[PDB]
Amino acid sequence: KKALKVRTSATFRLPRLDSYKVIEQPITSETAMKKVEDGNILVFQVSMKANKYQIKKAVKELYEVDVLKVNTLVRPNGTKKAYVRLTADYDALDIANR
Amino acid sequence: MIKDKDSAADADDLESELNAMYSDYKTRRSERDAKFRAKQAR
């Protein structure tokens, strides 16, 4: 005698990027320095592999300042420029002289 | 869950199931074109 079940299934299924690498050098053109002096915006050159989170974190770690916003663009010569606007508690000119 | 065993009736049922499966397979493979369905209609 064999005990086999009646209810059978209808289908059978098978059972190197740190703070010193992120920020390469600042931008010291007259427009960038004007932004530093007036708009409280530090202009930096950053690596092409860095996003806004990494740029903000790197600025915070290296320069000990609070970053309000970061706006990045890619320059025609294959390099990335970042505008970092700091919080009103910090003066960008003081950091630039430092 | 049925607690019964049959000697040759099981073989007959298995053969009938296999024949039905083969017939269904033939019908499914043949009904790929509507010409066959039209011919089988008449």
Partner: peptide
């Protein structure tokens, strides 16, 4: 329909050889 999916190929072949 096409119920043949309830049996895999190897089960079907090994039961066909039984007959």
């Amino acid at each position: 329909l096409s119920r043949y999916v309830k049996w895999p190929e190897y089960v079907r072949v090994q039961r066909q050889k039984k007959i």
